[PDB]
Design a protein around this ligand. Structure first.
Ligand SMILES: O=C(O)c1ccccc1O
Ligand SMILES: O=C(O)c1ccccc1O
Ligand SMILES: O=C(O)c1ccccc1O
Lengths: 262, 258
C-alpha cells in the first residue's frame, strides 16, 4: 500500500526544498527521494555545464532507469520541475503511477516542448522578475542563458507567505538555473502515446506570485489534466508554508490510485 | 552601530545551518554573514582538493583580508568551526571583538594545533561514530582521511533534540569533510601573541552528544577562556534547537566586549 514519492525541485532550488514534506510522507509509511538535479543543491556540476533540459534532468533519468522491473513511483514536480517530469514520463511512462505538478510548468504533447514556458513569458510582464539575474553563457550560434533569482524576487514573489527562516535558508542555498529555451523551443520531447499516457494531477497554489494562480489554471484548461487539486492560502513554496496540507493532498492522491487499482 | 557576526559552521555542514539564527540576529539590527567554507554548503570545491586546514578555511580568510581597515567583526565557530576561527584569530587578531566557540573544538597556543582533536579522538571509541564514513584520499607519504557523517550519527549524536524536519534538511545537505589531523599535528600555528590576544567565549551545549559537555568543560578547564557560557537543554545543534537562546547569548557578547 506504501508508495515511493520522487520529489523534483524547481529552479534555483534543490532536494533540500522538501525537508518539511519528506518527514511527513515518511511518517505516513511512504518512501521519499528528494533528488538534487544537475547543478542544484550540493551537486558539484556547474550551470555553464548544462546546455539542455536533459542534462539538467539527468539525475532524475538515472533514478528512473535504475528502477527495478517491479518498482513504480509517483513523481511530484515543483514549478520548473514539471519540465523535468515530462522527460521522465516520455521515457518511463510504465514506471509512473502518476505525475503531480505543483504550481509547475506542465508541458503538453501537442506544441513544442517550450510552449508552456513561452505562454508564461507572453503572459508575464518583465517587471515581475525584479532583481532576477539573467546572464548569457552560450555562444552566438548556440546561445544559452542562466537564471538566478535575487533576494527581492524570492522574498516578494516566491516566499511572500513564508517565514524569514525560510528566506534565510533559501538565500544560502539558491543557485543559478536555466529555462533551456533554445533546446525546448526547437523540439518536441513529449508525445501523446508516452508522455500523455501518464495520469496528470495539478496542485494549484492560490497565492502564488511567481507563477500566478491564473496561469496555473490556464495550463489546466489548456493542456488539460486528470485531476486538479488546490491548496488555498499557499504561496509558490507550498512545501514550506503549507507542508501538512501538501502532505494530505499527496496522500490522498496515492490513495485514490489504490482504489481504482489496488 | 550594529555588529558584524561571522558565523562559521562545523564539519559536513554549511552556512545554511544558521538559517534559524541569522534572521534573529538581523532583527536586532546586526549584520550577519553565514559563509560556506571550502567544499561546504554550495561551494563548488571538492573535499579531495583540501590538503590542509588553511585550504578549508580559505573562504573565511578571504573574508577577513577583505575587511576594511577599521572594520571589526565577531567570529562564531561551531564545533570544528572552532579550528577555522583559530587561523583567523592568528592572522587578523586586530579585526576581532571576540571569538565565540559554540560547543566547538577550541585550540590553544600552548601545544600542537591538533592537541584538542587528538584528546577527543582518544576519548571517542570507534562505535560512537556510528555510520560516519571515513575514507582516505591522499598519498601513502601524505595521507588524508575524509569524514562524512551518516544518518544515524546525525540523528542520535548531533540532532537527538532537534526536529525531524531539521534532520531531513541535514541529510539532504551534509557533505564529506575532514579533521585535517596530519596537517594540524605538525606545527603550532597558534601563538599567544596573536591568537591568544583575542578574547575567547565558550558556549557549552549541555545536551551535546557529539562533543559531550564533559569534553567541552575539559577544554575550558585546560586552555582557559575569557567567559564560559552555557545553553541548558541544547544538543549539538544549538542554532537549530535553541536559536532564540543562542541569539540572546550572542547579543550579550556583542554588548559586553566593546
Ligand atoms: O522554477 C521556479 O520556481 C520558477 C518561478 C518563477 C518563474 C519561473 C520559474 O522557473
Ligand atoms: O563538526 C562537528 O559538528 C563534529 C561533531 C562531532 C565530532 C567531530 C566534529 O567535527
Ligand atoms: O547513542 C547512540 O549511538 C544511539 C544509536 C542508535 C539509536 C539510539 C542511540 O541513542
Amino acid at each position: 500500500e506504501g508508495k515511493h514519492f520522487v520529489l523534483v525541485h524547481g529552479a534555483c532550488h534543490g532536494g533540500w526544498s522538501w525537508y518539511k514534506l519528506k518527514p511527513l510522507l515518511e511518517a505516513a509509511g511512504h518512501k521519499v527521494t528528494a533528488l538534487d538535479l544537475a547543478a542544484s543543491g550540493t551537486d558539484l556540476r556547474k550551470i555553464e555545464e548544462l546546455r539542455t533540459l536533459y542534462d539538467y534532468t539527468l539525475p532524475l533519468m538515472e533514478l528512473m532507469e535504475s528502477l527495478s522491473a517491479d518498482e513504480k513511483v509517483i513523481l511530484v514536480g515543483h514549478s520548473l520541475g514539471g519540465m523535468n517530469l515530462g522527460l521522465a514520463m516520455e521515457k518511463y511512462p510504465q514506471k509512473i503511477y502518476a505525475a503531480v505538478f505543483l504550481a509547475a510548468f506542465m508541458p503538453d504533447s501537442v506544441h513544442n516542448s517550450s510552449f508552456v514556458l513561452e505562454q508564461y513569458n507572453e503572459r508575464t510582464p518583465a517587471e515581475n522578475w525584479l532583481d532576477t539575474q539573467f546572464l548569457p553563457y552560450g555562444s552566438p550560434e548556440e546561445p544559452l542563458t542562466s537564471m538566478f533569482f535575487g533576494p527581492k524576487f524570492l522574498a516578494h514573489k516566491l516566499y511572500q507567505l513564508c517565514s524569514p527562516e525560510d528566506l534565510a535558508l533559501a538565500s544560502s542555498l539558491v543557485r543559478p538555473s536555466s529555462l533551456f529555451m533554445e533546446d525546448l523551443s526547437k523540439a518536441k520531447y513529449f508525445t501523446d502515446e508516452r508522455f500523455g499516457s501518464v495520469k496528470r494531477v495539478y496542485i494549484v497554489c492560490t497565492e502564488d506570485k511567481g507563477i500566478p494562480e491564473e496561469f496555473q489554471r490556464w495550463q489546466i484548461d489548456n493542456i488539460g489534466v486528470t485531476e486538479a487539486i488546490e491548496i488555498k492560502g499557499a504561496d509558490h513554496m507550498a512545501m514550506l508554508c503549507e507542508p501538512q496540507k501538501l502532505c494530505a493532498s499527496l496522500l490522498e492522491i496515492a490513495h485514490k490510485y489504490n482504489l481504482e487499482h489496488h
